[PDB]
Amino acid sequence: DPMVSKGEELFTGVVPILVELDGDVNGHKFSVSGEGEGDATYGKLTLKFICTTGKLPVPWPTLVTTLVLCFSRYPDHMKQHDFFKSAMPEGYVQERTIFFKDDGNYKTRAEVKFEGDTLVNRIELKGIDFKEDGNILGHKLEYNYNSHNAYIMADKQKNGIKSNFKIRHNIEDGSVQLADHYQQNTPIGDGPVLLPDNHYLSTQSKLSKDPNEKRDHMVLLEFVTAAGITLG
């Protein structure tokens, strides 16, 4: 399928990634710049993010989902369901509302597209209704991340996809902070895409620090795989 091969050719080998985010949470303005590479053959990306405005006013783990699902590994029997690569190089808009239980919400809008040979994720984020001294603005979340699945559903009206899933953030008191994610993706172009049938993505992320890096930062290793139509 030339529509499938288009994405395969765009994501063959190691693709450079640039991530740029401008944020405002409760009036705290911040920016994040990320660089790295993705290897969609293995569902793999490596990225290092810098807070370029000083200290990040929210915990790094809360930004992992916001900071490129085109790098997901879709197995051979699933390639017809890979909306994300099919929208390339023109790209897609990824929009979310992330509801933090008993706290505020992030609203995010991002464009994911190629600029030359580089896959770019450009993001605006606005956070509201946060507690200035809660788990998020108070930095009470552990610097780690939990694996999860997410159900992807076609959004025919928008020629795109939608997904609603739960992220669990460990709190430093031993409890868990829920982050309920609403997501919708729409192609930037007006041409055909691969509109998928419902299926699951499975993802694991590892967060680490560069001991030589004095700036506030996050090193991310992230694997995403299309697990199947069903979980079985």
> Residues 41, 143: contact at Cβ < 8 Å?
no
CA pair distance 125, 100, nearest whole angstrom = 14
Count Cβ atoms within 10 A of the Cβ of residue 64 and give its class: 0-12 exposed, 13-18 middle, 19 or more buried: buried
Alpha helix stretches (DSSP H) within the chain: 2-10, 83-86
CA pair distance 57, 99, nearest whole angstrom = 17
CA pair distance 62, 144, nearest whole angstrom = 10
> Residues 152, 198: contact at Cβ < 8 Å?
yes
> Residues 197, 16: contact at Cβ < 8 Å?
no
CA pair distance 223, 202, nearest whole angstrom = 8
Q: Which residue has the tokens 């610097």?
A: 143
CA pair distance 136, 115, nearest whole angstrom = 33
Using alpha carbons only, give the angle 34, 144, 71 rounded to the nearest 5 degrees. Answer: 45
CATH code for residues 2-228: 2.40.155.10
> Residues 112, 68: contact at Cβ < 8 Å?
yes
CA pair distance 64, 36, nearest whole angstrom = 14
CA pair distance 201, 28, nearest whole angstrom = 33
The ranges assigned to domains in the chain are: 2-228
Looking at the chain, how many residues does it have? 232
Q: Which residue has the tokens 């939990």?
A: 146
Half-sphere exposure of 216 (CA within 13 A, CB side): 15
Query: CB 211: neighbour CB atoms within 10 A?
Result: 6
Which residue, 98, 84, 97, is CA-closest to 40? 84
Query: What Å resolution does this PDB entry report?
Result: 1.5
Instruction: Label residues 121-153 b or e (16+ Cβ within 10 Å = b).
Output: bbbbbebeebeeeebbbebbbeeebeebebebe
Instruction: Label residues 170-182 b or e (16+ Cβ within 10 Å = b).
Output: beeeeeebebebe
